[PDB]
Amino acid sequence: MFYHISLEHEILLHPRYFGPNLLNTVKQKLFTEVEGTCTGKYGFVIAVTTIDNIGAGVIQPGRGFVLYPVKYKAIVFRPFKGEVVDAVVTQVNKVGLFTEIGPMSCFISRHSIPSEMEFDPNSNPPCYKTMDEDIVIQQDDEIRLKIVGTRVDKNDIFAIGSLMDDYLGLV
């Protein structure tokens, strides 16, 4: 589920930016620094909705940089294990299905693809289809998957999806 939360971040403003428009520069730098970044604790941050407060800028001894602790309201998304989430399949391969859920990308391993499914490599767009052809899962389709687990690496989060349970798969 998407979450709107207040986040704590410290802006080390370079002295050249002091004087007029300092706080505006802090706001601009905050967006620039936090937006487009991800953290294992809070996940991906989409946008800063507003800033709760700009703390008193502590001048760093020797560094000259001023450390501004900032509280800002932002929207984030984190995948939770043991939960069902709607997803869009991005790439289909014999190894598994790659899917996108907002900022997060989830992978469904072949072992987690239902027994009724089977990969159809001869098809021009790779897809998995059932023996009776009742449902077909391909790229850019509406599917629901179970978050088996969440992993984080290099400021990126990727989860494992499963379609074995009921009400899953193509919807």
Q: Which residue has the tokens 């802006």?
A: 11
Supply the minimum distance, in Å, between the C-beta of residue 93 and other proteins. 10
Q: How many CA atoms lie within 13 A of 152 on its CB side?
A: 12
Does position 36 bind other proteins by CB under 8 A? yes
Per CB under 8 A, 100 contacts other proteins: yes
Which range binds other proteins by CB under 8 A, 11-19, 57-65, 113-121, 122-130? 113-121
Among 22, 46, 135, 170, binds other proteins (CB under 8 A): 46
Task: Choose one: 16-24, 51-59, 79-87, 120-128; the region binding other proteins (CB under 8 A).
Answer: 79-87
Is residue 114 involved in binding other proteins (CB under 8 A)? yes
Query: Which of 10/35 has CB closer to other proteins?
Result: 35
Cβ pair 156, 38 in contact under 8 A: yes
How far out from the chain centre does Cα 136 lie? Answer: 26
Whose CA is closest to 119, among 33, 143, 111? 111
CB of 67 to other proteins, least distance (A): 23
125 or 167: whose CB is closer to other proteins? 167
80 in contact with other proteins (CB under 8 A): yes
Which of 62/111 has CB closer to other proteins?
Answer: 111
Residue 111 contacts other proteins per CB under 8 A? yes
- Positive or negative, the Cα torsion across 98, 100, 104, 108? negative
Quick one: which segment of 10-18, 44-52, 56-64, 121-129 binds other proteins (CB under 8 A)?
A: 44-52
- Shorter beta-carbon distance to other proteins: residue 21 or 28: 28
Query: Tokens 């009742």 sit at which residue?
Result: 134
User: What is the DSSP secondary-structure string of 94-130?
Assistant: SSEEEEEETTEEEEEEGGGS-TTEEE-TTSSS--EEE
Distance between CA atoms of residues 143 and 48, nearest Å: 29
